[PDB]
Amino acid sequence: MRECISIHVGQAGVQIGNACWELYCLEHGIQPDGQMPDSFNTFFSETGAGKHVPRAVFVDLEPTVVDEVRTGTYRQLFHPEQLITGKEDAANNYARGHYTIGKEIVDLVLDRIRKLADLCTGLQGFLIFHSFGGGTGSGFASLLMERLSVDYGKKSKLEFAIYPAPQVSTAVVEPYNSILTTHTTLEHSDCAFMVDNEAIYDICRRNLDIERPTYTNLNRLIGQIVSSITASLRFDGALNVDLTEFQTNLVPYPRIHFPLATYAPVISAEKAYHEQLSVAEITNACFEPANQMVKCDPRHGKYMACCMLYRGDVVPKDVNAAIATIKTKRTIQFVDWCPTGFKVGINYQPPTVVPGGDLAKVQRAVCMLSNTTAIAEAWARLDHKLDLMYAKRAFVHWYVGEGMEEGEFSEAREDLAALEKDYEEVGVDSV
Amino acid sequence: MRECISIHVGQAGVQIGNACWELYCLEHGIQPDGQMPDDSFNTFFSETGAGKHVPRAVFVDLEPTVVDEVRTGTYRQLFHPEQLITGKEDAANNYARGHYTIGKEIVDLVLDRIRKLADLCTGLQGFLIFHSFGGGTGSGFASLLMERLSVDYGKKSKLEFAIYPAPQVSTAVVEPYNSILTTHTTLEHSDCAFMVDNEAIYDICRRNLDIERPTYTNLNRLIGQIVSSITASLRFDGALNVDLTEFQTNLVPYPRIHFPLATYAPVISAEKAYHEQLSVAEITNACFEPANQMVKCDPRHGKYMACCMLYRGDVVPKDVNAAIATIKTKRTIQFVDWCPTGFKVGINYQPPTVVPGGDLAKVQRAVCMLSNTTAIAEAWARLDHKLDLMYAKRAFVHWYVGEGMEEGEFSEAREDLAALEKDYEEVGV
Amino acid sequence: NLNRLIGQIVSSITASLRFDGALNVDLTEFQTNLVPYPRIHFPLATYAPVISAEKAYHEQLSVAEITNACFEPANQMVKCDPRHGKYMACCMLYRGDVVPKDVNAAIATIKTKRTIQFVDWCPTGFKVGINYQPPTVVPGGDLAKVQRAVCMLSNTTAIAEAWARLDHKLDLMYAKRAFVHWYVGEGMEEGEFSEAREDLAALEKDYEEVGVDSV
Amino acid sequence: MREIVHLQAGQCGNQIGAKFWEVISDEHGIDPTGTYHGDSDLQLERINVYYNEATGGKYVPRAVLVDLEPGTMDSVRSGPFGQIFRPDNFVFGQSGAGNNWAKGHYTEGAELVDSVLDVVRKEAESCDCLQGFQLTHSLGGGTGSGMGTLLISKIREEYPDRIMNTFSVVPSPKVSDTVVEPYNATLSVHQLVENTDETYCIDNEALYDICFRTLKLTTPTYGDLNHLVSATMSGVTTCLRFPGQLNADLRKLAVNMVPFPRLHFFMPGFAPLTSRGSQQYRALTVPELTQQMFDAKNMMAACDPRHGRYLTVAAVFRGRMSMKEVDEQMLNVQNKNSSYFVEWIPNNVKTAVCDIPPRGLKMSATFIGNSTAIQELFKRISEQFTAMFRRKAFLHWYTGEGMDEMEFTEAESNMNDLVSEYQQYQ
Amino acid sequence: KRMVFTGPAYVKDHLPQVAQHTAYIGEKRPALEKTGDLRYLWRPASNRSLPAKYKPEYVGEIGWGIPEYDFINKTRLQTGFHIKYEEFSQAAIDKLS
Ligand SMILES: Nc1nc2c(ncn2[C@@H]2O[C@H](COP(=O)(O)OP(=O)(O)OP(=O)(O)O)[C@@H](O)[C@H]2O)c(=O)[nH]1
Ligand SMILES: Nc1nc2c(ncn2[C@@H]2O[C@H](COP(=O)(O)OP(=O)(O)OP(=O)(O)O)[C@@H](O)[C@H]2O)c(=O)[nH]1
Ligand SMILES: Nc1nc2c(ncn2[C@@H]2O[C@H](COP(=O)(O)OP(=O)(O)O)[C@@H](O)[C@H]2O)c(=O)[nH]1
């Protein structure tokens, strides 16, 4: 009745998901083999043999990220036919996820998506995990978006993309790949959330006591920000929102569908002995630039729309007091054509703690979903990084030999310049 | 009073029976020595006063190397010593040697044993003839068996479980010669001829099962599971019991168009069956794909004519009609305009049994569709092409004529199969 | 709840044969008084003091108003309005402690009212009989325990209006020959219904033609 | 002393009778072994209508069991209530009909009808005053349709002054359970039109719909499906076994229900149908009962009466109730729905009441309806027939027996005359 | 043709396999608002269940309480209003006979 389908395409998606499903099975009573010694079918499917198989499609075109899942402790909990494995790595080429080697495996992914959705009766969205830098996450996700939006249609697909940071990066062809995967997803998507790894590094350095972080900590934080989205289905609260509720509260225009996501009480265990974690400080603790999970200061933009989901012992009385004081300060920018701005959601389920994880046992937690005009500088810098390299068509000779012509970059340029002019058109006011 | 007499002729027939009668003793309480430590065994097993149970089958072959395995197998105390008839000379992939020279010499022994088995019977209604279209004994000696039985026992419905030759992979070379003649001499004496292909169980065991590199013994178990699904209603109760007479007045519209297929839906490993939901609306939906059938021919070339469904275990009827009502609403699954009814259901009330050390899962539901499609006309067309390319230069004619054949019956079975193809095109207008 | 009313009507009818009174009426003066013609013998029936065990003891029940509420059209056992027809001959049977004088008093009131109309050839109209015994009551009965009772028999021409719908029902049914094969199977002709309808129409003609005057 | 004789042919008729005798044995307090163990003396008072008395207080049903195959009576006898049936009344054949009307009518039916007539002549002449015959079969089956109609023909020739009533299962509108179902149904109901007196048509899909929406039962079986047929089955002969304020036997309903001899195709119903989770919250009174009656989705046939008009409607009530409200509500439901009844008949509803409600229900009732909307049920059968017959789909199992094409043509002609007769009165 | 016996070798009868559970495996969690059986439509409760009675055991019916509540009609019974057969009526009765 309240199901959701997860597709973890690329390496980043499944390396998020291996901790994400630990979080999901820990919030319920499911052992890691698949047995329990309603309120679970939003993410799992109980079978007659007593096993609890999740609804997830793990897909990568190279095997070295799914075989440790197939030999790990979750080998008895998954369904060993949906763990789709390719042969050759996409290898950071958009040609090798959308044109050459992605098209002989996408039929199996579509068939497994259809088989997973036929069992359900109350579908209300998708949870697609990818990244905007690589080749699998930017090539194969954009391939199946065009299929899922033409065979399902009105369903509200939700996606999670890791945006390339300003300063730190790993690939050097990702200015091409991000614009290429933006050009196709922009007309077949609903609400995708940007996260930058540099901002999570700053967060895990500043208000988190642990230095020298691995990728597991970042994946745990991302799993916590996803688990707060779907906390209103398996747990009933005061103000409940569904998955298609997000589709109509954060997308002012069909082109502008890139909001951010911040988790407010990302604080240590030793420092939590010292703080009064009331809702008043929590509500504006996420509003600081030091806690935003995208490296962009809000003051050069305006907060176009905002959505908050609360958890734990949160009374709605002081929520109104906390949210009223935010729009009284002059620095939280707001312009004329959106006077309301905010939306609230509450629940009675405390945020859980994974043993061995770093996040402390806090009992009040909010996540903010917000789309700002302070993201146009990221598009400007990606546009500059593309046009500095296309001055003499540098890396094109790998792409053209594997499926498409040179003209596909000019169309992406004409798309992103239109997006930039749309953002600066939205920013100005009408007197 | 619903008995069956099983005829296993040919290497393929005896090797299939080695699995069918392994399953049958397991489904009842029959020990391998023929002992049962409350009378549902009677459709396949007899009764002798010490408590011994003797099956009703005739294992007959022309070379001894196969039946000698059964004589020294793990079932040597079960079968009647006389009912394992064997010859002394192999027919050697020759319709002539199995139909005119060696088969006529030994055909009286098997008919006598069949007559004795029918004299032990009281309410016999079916014949289960197991062979393959490939070799000499299963194509010539089986043909002579149905020729003699159809004139002797009258209107008794004989059902035939024959192995079709695949158009791409085949063992022998003379395969079209040994299939065309038996199809010509079978077409007026059979009632229903369920056809199974070897390549289409290979791809199923590669795909549905995670089996790589299988043998014949994996194929024979699936064949035995289907044949047990056919005669499940004679042994156990259920909402709708389907005996062998309405497999015959329901599945075949015209006296010549009697070549139906078979398909077993819940075929899956015993490890994937944990994590997959075996709902009746799913297995029926997962029965009509071209990739889940035991004939290579894609059903999208033609239109279905009559389909019969057999359900085992706790299958309740409304999801049955919901499933085959959603089937009727699919534009891909196309029927003929002259059959608005189309389907037939039968419900049984026991779960499908699994042999220990087997491959198939422990499941509570089971579907066996016996479809009859126009698309088998292509399967006759390619074998017609194979006939015409060989006979044009008399490729292997002398091996046949030298064993009591002529030239004219080669040039009449071609016209017989041309007429059969013309009939198959006629029903699709 | 109806069979006790019919039993009370029939017990009031034969009340004079059972108990003594001032004016006993035997079963022959009913015929001589209420039946003018051999064919015109279809009267009504009215039991006026029909009341509950609670709406009886809030009121006095004299003979002036139990003889008055009886003439209203909401108290007879056949659905017909007496204002359409003309009364032919009327019989009143009083049970219980009824002095004979106020019977004639209420009679003089009834003949005074112009809202009801009689036929001209009946200058007398009313035959009365006073039984001296009160009615009895049933355990668990609907009817109250009362001292006075009256049962009217009224020959009116308004009962032909009750016959004016059943013939219409027959004209609706017989036109399409419905339900006829159940009758004509056991020794019946298709034309018997025709003569039955003609006999009923003759009865309607008789009731129409009695109430006219020749001057 | 108005005895009835029960007949059952085919596995559908046998498994419907196996639940009807469940209901009747529960009503009269009869043990599985055949002993009376109820409380009241009213349940024993007319036990002769459905049961035959024997010595020692053992009661045997007056049922005749038959088919062509030994498949289903082995389960019928070995069930919970299989010991009550007489071992003499078990007659059977050898070859299954194979869903063939030819095999159940001329080859095997001809050599098996003689023993069934032996059993019926044994049982019928022992009764004091036989009221009529009752049969259960399936229109789409082989040994039911082919041989129960032979039984009807062979019985109607010997008692021409009784009442014949059949208990049919019509082919479903959407999903067919047999591909020769129009072939096996057209001939059967062609023989059924001229011989029987009152028939009752049951569709499986309508029962699934009423068990899924009104009953809120997502998973009913066939055994629970036959319980509603048993409900409308025992509700029509309740006045022959129990006293009431206004009694009506089977012949009274036959007189009040059939205006012309070829129009006797009735749709059965049942009034108090609730869910399990909504039992505490029903408040059974006559208004909601008669409002649940005339609802189009309370019907046990696949015919929605909105496309047609009711001719005559029966309503047999059972239990403690008063009487003005019954007449008032058959006035009301006829008054506001005058477009759905016939204007050339003044009163369309026949009412009857009884005094003893069923075991555990405050009151109950049974709906029988003669509507001209049943012409669409024969129309789809005629369309499927004339689509299969045009290309000679499966005919060679009939002319391969010894039939003729012209008998198929005259069966289709009779169907068209019946449809035209039902359409003409609209 | 008819058998004397429906069992093996023309002796005794056939005892089929009986399904122990004719109902349906709830493969998922079985619902609380699920009306699984259908014998609940008229089930008599254990021990206490209402029998079948007649009109004298009814209320407000015919023959109900006639000898019990006879005191209501006693005042109409004890009056001296019934006609007593005197000498002349008895003489007429004897005159006819
Ligand atoms: N948070 C997080 N980010 C990751 C993780 N693994 C890789 N990334 C990010 O992913 C970016 C590169 O894109 P990928 O998703 O790895 O590329 P891909 O989709 O796997 O394409 P291929 O490597 O060709 O298969 C890097 O810049 C990393 O920042 C991870 O485990 N956690
Ligand atoms: N599926 C299946 N096919 C078999 C099996 N055994 C033999 N075959 C088939 O048998 C064919 C070989 O010709 P046969 O019919 O066995 O030859 P024959 O008539 O028996 O003559 P002999 O082999 O000498 O006894 C091949 O096409 C095989 O596909 C088996 O166990 N399973
Ligand atoms: N409601 C119900 N229908 C049944 C039952 N058994 C069979 N049927 C119906 O009977 C039809 C099959 O015809 P059938 O009489 O069984 O064939 P036959 O026995 O060879 O004459 C199917 O359409 C079923 O819907 C049952 O127990 N209950």
Ligand SMILES: [Mg+2]
């Ligand atoms: Mg990778």
Ligand SMILES: [Mg+2]
């Ligand atoms: Mg061989």
